[PDB]
Each structure stands twice: as structure tokens, then as C-alpha cells.
Design brief:
The structure is cut from a larger assembly and holds one chain. The chain is largely without helices or strands. Helices cover about 0% and strands about 0% of the residues. The two termini are about 30 Å apart. DNA-dependent RNA polymerase catalyzes the transcription of DNA into RNA using the four ribonucleoside triphosphates as substrates. This is DNA-directed RNA polymerase subunit beta'. The RNAP catalytic core consists of 2 alpha, 1 beta, 1 beta' and 1 omega subunit. When a sigma factor is associated with the core the holoenzyme is formed, which can initiate transcription. Belongs to the RNA polymerase beta' chain family. It is classed as transferase.
């Protein structure tokens, strides 16, 4: 839902988007990695190639994997996006600009922690 969901006029680590149910459909390629806990989620990495594959921001609204992740591969980011999707109270927020592919938008933020 591209039309005004997250607010730029917000405090560092608060609330984001409106009822994003149920986003899961497609995210390319995955592997297995050891547990690396955080504040709200984990530090999932596809440690598979030297040059980065995916920068894993595990949002407040996701289920981090333990040893699983080798049965579908093509588009398996287990657990949907439902409700609020909050933000840990330390990481900052900076800038947004939209893309063209179908129905969704790409976002970037600077994680100062």
C-alpha cells in the first residue's frame, strides 16, 4: 500500500505503516545461519557469498529462523507483515523514495545503535 502509510514526521523508533496484511509473497533466495539475537528479531544473514546478498532488517513483526530455511528457497520470508510494525528505540530514521515494478515501494533507513 504505497499511498501514505509511514510518517516521516516521527520520533526515533516509534510506529510505521497501516495494516499491511498479508505481505509475504516474494523474496529471492535464502540459506541457513547461526542464531544472532537482537532487540526485536534477529540478525539473519545469507552467509553464502562475499559480496552482500540481503541486508537483513528484521522488523518488529517477523519470525526469525533457527536452523530452518532450505525447503522452498525461491520466496520464503516466513511470517507475514500484519498490524503495526514498530521500531526499536535506538535506531534512527532517514529518507524515502519510491520505485516502479508493480504495486510496492522500496525503503532505506540508517540504523544508528
Amino acid at each position: 500500500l504505497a499511498a501514505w502509510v509511514e510518517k516521516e514526521a516521527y520520533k526515533p523508533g516509534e510506529i510505521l505503516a497501516e495494516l499491511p496484511e498479508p505481505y509475504l509473497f516474494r523474496a529471492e533466495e535464502e540459506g541457513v545461519v547461526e542464531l544472532k539475537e537482537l532487540e526485536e528479531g534477529a540478525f539473519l544473514v545469507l552467509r553464502r557469498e562475499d559480496e552482500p546478498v540481503a541486508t537483513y532488517f528484521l522488523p518488529v513483526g517477523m519470525t526469525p529462523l533457527v536452523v530452518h530455511g532450505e525447503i522452498v528457497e525461491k520466496g520464503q520470508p516466513l511470517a507475514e507483515a500484519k498490524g503495526l510494525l514498530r521500531m526499536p528505540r535506538q535506531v534512527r530514521a532517514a529518507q524515502v523514495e519510491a520505485e516502479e515494478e508493480g504495486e510496492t515501494v522500496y525503503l532505506t533507513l540508517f540504523l544508528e545503535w
